[PDB]
With several copies, the nearest count.
Chain A
Amino acid sequence: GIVEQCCTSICSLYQLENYCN
């Protein structure tokens, strides 16, 4: 998922917004 991706790879802040409420 996102947890995994940002840590093994990279992720953007806009990808993180997909986890806001």
Chain B
Amino acid sequence: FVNQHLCGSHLVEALYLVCGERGFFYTPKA
């Protein structure tokens, strides 16, 4: 696996790929 530069919805896509089934939490600092 390679390092990632992921902004915006691209990071939700990478989380969804990484966690699959388990799901994930998307928690931006804000």
Contacts and interface: CB of A to CB of B under 8 A. Distances in A.
Contacts, number: 78
A1 B29 contact: yes
Do most interface residues of chain B lie in helix, strand or loop, or is the interface mixed?
mixed
Contact of A4 (B24, B26, B29): B29
Q: Is the interface of A mostly helix, strand, loop or mixed?
A: helix
Given A3-B28, A4-B28, A20 B4 contact: no
A14 B1 contact: yes
12 contacts: A2-B15, A2-B26, A3-B28, A6-B4, A6-B5, A7-B7, A10-B3, A13-B4, A16-B15, A19-B26, A20-B24, A21-B27
